[model samples]
Target: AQPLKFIAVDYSPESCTHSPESSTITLTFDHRGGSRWRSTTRFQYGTFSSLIQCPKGNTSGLNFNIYLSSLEGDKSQDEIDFEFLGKDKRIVQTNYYTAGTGNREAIHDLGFDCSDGFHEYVIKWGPDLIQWLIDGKVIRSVRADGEGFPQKPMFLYASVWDASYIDEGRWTGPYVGSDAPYICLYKNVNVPVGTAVE
Candidate 1:
């Protein structure tokens, strides 16, 4: 299930580049952080995976996230996330929302620093379930038996930004931006061709 081609992605604050000789995209952000890249279309259920290397150091008050989100109007801003809350290098957070209501959240300690190297982060969103896996093991899963199951078509996205502006600056901590110019690498984003039938 490999992505056939690498498509051009849109970003904010304008600081990103693809290798002159390869398809790898690098996103660099400094103080007053901003996000990067949104895959261009809405797709039905399928397994979307990406190999990425997160930024290192005391990224307190920052967020590095990769996930699938709704592609429609604000009636329901559905979202599913695999966010690396920047205060700790070993933690990965997962959550989802359906038709605008959301509260389910889970976090896992990877036991290794993601900034040390590229690791495969995968989301298998099928008809009745969504599974978040790192490498080849399932780290978290959600069932559609509940009311807040995400059923809308969604576009894949990846972004890095400061979170200090929200939640009394407690979610990821306070941002001093002492660690500016942080970068994350993306590669081998595989979005398989077949849809996940209900």
Candidate 2:
């Protein structure tokens, strides 16, 4: 089967401030660590770890949402996210996919790391399956066969949220003012299986 195609917008901290020359709705990030900053709504930057949260209210016809992190390490505990919210705010629905696990036997690394510039993260949407990818490579998949699985169309979102609740030690302070610790970049998105791309 062919892949679905959809529209994608790139969000950068500098171009996406409260006011801008264009009318584009850009996501913002908080600066921390010297002169770097992180996005408050969807990401938490750590000294040696980082995390992101998928945005909510995505009901587009697309099948999957992909996230590419800009961090690297031989044994880093970073994660790419496909987050969903339930009635209870405390229990957020999550699918944790890791990189560089085991004795180099698993090979979960997403190919490129933060040091290598921007990487491509992808999600494949099918009739009953959603597949996750890093740098155009498959890492994990989820099927709709089980209970609470998604059956309707979905939208695409990318954001870096904090995960300090899991381990407070990983926090990188309250972002560095409004100019440091920024998590901003562009996305070269493509939909290979839908009318949008045609």
What's the count of clashing pairs in each model shown? 0, 31
Q: What is the C-alpha lDDT profile of model 2 across 10-84, one tens digit per residue? A: 434453332222212223334321111222222222111112222222211111123323232225333334331
> 8 in model 2: Cα distance from truth in Å?
11
The models' CA-based lDDT, in order, is 0.78, 0.32
Q: Candidate 2 at 108: error in angstroms?
A: 4.9
The clash number for model 2 is 31
160 Cα displacement, candidate 1 (Å): 0.7
Instruction: Give residue 180's lDDT in candidate 1 (0 to 100).
Output: 78
Q: Which candidate ranks first by TM-score, i.e. highest?
A: 1
lDDT of 1 by residue, 13-95 (tens): 46666663555767776853565676656768888988899876678888888888885236677888898888788889899
Worst 10 residues of 2 by lDDT: 41-50
